[PDB]
Paper text:
To understand the structural basis of the receptor rearrangements during its gating cycle, we elucidated the GluK3EM structure in the desensitized and resting/closed state using single particle cryo-EM. These states were captured in the presence of agonist 2S, 4R-4-methyl glutamate (SYM)26 and antagonist UBP310 respectively. Further, the resolution of our EM maps is adequate to show unambiguously that in both desensitized and closed state the ion channel adopts a closed pore configuration, where the M3 helices are arranged in a crossed bundle assembly with the pre-M1 helices wrapped around the channel. In the desensitized state, the LBD-TM linker strain due to bound agonist is relaxed via rearrangements of LBD from a dimer of dimer scheme to a pseudo-4 fold symmetric arrangement, where the LBD dimers are disrupted. Consistent with a 4-fold symmetric arrangement of LBDs in the desensitized state, LBD-helix E separation in both distal A/C and proximal B/D subunit pairs is equal at ~21 Å. Interestingly, the residual densities are in close proximity to potential N-linked glycosylation sites. In particular, the density near Asn 247 in ATD and Asn 402 in LBD appear more prominent in distal subunits as compared to proximal subunits. Hence, the presence of this residual density at positions corresponding to N-glycan likely indicates protein-glycan interactions.
AMPA, KA, and NMDA receptors form tetrameric cation conductive channels that are activated by presynaptically released glutamate resulting in an influx of sodium and calcium ions leading to membrane depolarization. KA receptors are abundantly expressed in hippocampus and cerebellum; display characteristic slow kinetics, are mainly involved in long-term memory formation and motor control. They are divided into two families consisting of the “low-affinity” glutamate binding subunits (GluK1-[name]) that form functional homomeric ion channels and “high-affinity” subunits (GluK4 and GluK5) that form functional receptors only on assembly with “low-affinity” subunits.
Residue numbers in the entry:
A (entry chain B): 3 to 272, 285 to 385, 402 to 405
B (entry chain A): 52 to 102
C (entry chain A): 153 to 203
D (entry chain D): 204 to 253
Write the structure that this text describes.
């Protein structure tokens, strides 16, 4: 007894592109080692499928998904672009198929759709954790600095936060036009700035490290805020001895010895640290694995796009999916069942020494931080 | 002229393939931009502009 | 509306202007709680784009 | 000059490349390895020429 899933990746030259990413590496890696994990599914065999498309096309993955359903695949994970996952979610909900998602996309309540989840953290909870942070910083003046236009929407909660907690603020964008924002950094040193928040790519984070290193803007007077978890690619021995107050975030249980050993075995396999996106991949695989294990026998079938064939227990296994309870690599995974979407997740709060980076606090959406005589 | 519902990319995708099988020159799409992203994708893919 | 006017959000580089920020809760249309919040602000020079 | 490069490396590494720091540089081979990473820190600084 064998089951098979699919997967669609965007590349430079599509199917004619050459190099697998580390996500495909972790995909084959995780799937084959859990097939090796004979704790999983004695009589059932899990196989998979990997599709290469180009960046920025819905129609490529549309044809690929029609191919995968002409095969008939037991589960489907989601692509990168919003334009892809639009049509992916449309045909998934239209044909009783779940759409597993990973990134943030815009999601209308006006678009009342069902057959999907996402592995992406709710930005309102993220921004409120940052609110918990900065009221623990007790700040009344700050400055918004951001890479792309998407993070404004993804931080508009924090943008509203000067209402209920008054704080001075300046709002400027990292220019994507080149690899340089140093005259803006000259403005910022003239801007008398010490309280700055940073959301960007790990690549842009390395650009920040390089420039603020080179600008003379690595000062102990700086206490700066960093969203992404991806400092592990980045060196800090040029940085951690300058006295700059600093804060990273974490959702991963690195402090699990088991998960750290998974990273350890991963480290031999292409700094040499398992990607958060790969951890998301591993967790998505394992949640779909658990929801498949909980269910009884069903009807693995092949359906067609131009017709209207929808797989009958797609709503049943969607109920298996949206109501799941799994302890992942990042830890507890639980959904807002009004949405069926993961909005509840804890945040490990970490910071730096000259010793190195270290965990300094926790966070939760419920609560938050936790650190005979004579007169 | 095709009357479709709101908020479905695949609906107008089917109808877009329909008007392609017809062959149309002026492409008058839906309100939902997330719907018509695939429309622009197939327009730019199949050598035809998009309004 | 943010991407509709983020430069107008990031306007005060060129001028000494401060501003409040108020999303309408699209859940319903009785903004009278938010109207009394505006009344707490009691402000008089406000931008409006909506339907 | 080697230990001078050591000075630049360490005050770089310690973040002591500050505008509040004003520099008296003496030997003639200051130029040897690259000084441009130390240029844009924004310090006050002085060298010699022969």
């Amino acid at each position: 007894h064998v089951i098979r899933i699919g997967g669609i990746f965007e590349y430079a030259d599509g199917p004619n592109a050459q190099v697998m990413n580390a996500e495909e590496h972790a995909f084959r890696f995780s799937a084959n080692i859990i097939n090796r994990n004979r704790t999983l599914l004695p009589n059932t065999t899990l196989t998979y499928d990997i599709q290469r498309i180009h960046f920025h096309d819905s129609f490529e993955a549309t044809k690929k998904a029609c191919d995968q359903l002409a095969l008939g695949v037991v589960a489907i994970f989601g692509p990168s672009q919003g334009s892809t996952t639009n049509a992916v979610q449309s045909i998934c909900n239209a044909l009783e198929v779940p759409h597993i998602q990973l990134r943030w996309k815009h999601h209308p309540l006006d678009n009342k759709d069902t057959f999907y989840v996402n592995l992406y953290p709710d930005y309102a909870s993220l921004s409120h954790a940052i609110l918990d942070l900065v009221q623990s910083l007790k700040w009344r003046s700050a400055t918004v600095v951001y890479d792309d236009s998407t993070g404004l929407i993804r931080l508009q909660e924090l943008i509203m936060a000067p209402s209920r907690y008054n704080i001075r603020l300046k709002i400027r964008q990292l220019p994507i036009d080149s690899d340089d924002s140093r005259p803006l950094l000259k403005e910022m040193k003239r801007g008398r700035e010490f309280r700055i928040i940073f959301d960007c790519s790990h690549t842009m984070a390395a650009q920040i490290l390089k420039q603020a290193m080179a600008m003379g803007m690595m000062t102990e007077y700086y206490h700066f805020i960093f969203t992404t978890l991806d400092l592990y690619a980045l060196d800090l021995e040029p940085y951690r001895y300058s006295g700059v107050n600093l804060t990273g975030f974490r959702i991963l249980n690195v402090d699990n010895p088991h998960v750290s050993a998974i990273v350890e075995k991963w480290s031999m396999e292409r700094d040499g640290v398992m990607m958060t996106d790969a951890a998301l991949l591993y967790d998505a695989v394992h949640i779909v694995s658990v929801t498949y294990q909980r269910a009884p026998q069903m009807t693995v079938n092949s359906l067609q796009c131009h017709r209207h064939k929808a797989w009958r227990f797609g709503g049943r296994f969607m109920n298996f999916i949206k109501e799941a309870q799994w302890e992942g690599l990042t830890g507890r995974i639980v959904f807002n069942k009004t949405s069926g979407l993961r909005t509840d997740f804890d945040l490990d709060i970490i910071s730096l020494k000259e010793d190195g980076l270290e965990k300094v606090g926790v966070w939760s959406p419920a609560d938050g931080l936790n650190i005979n005589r004579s007169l």
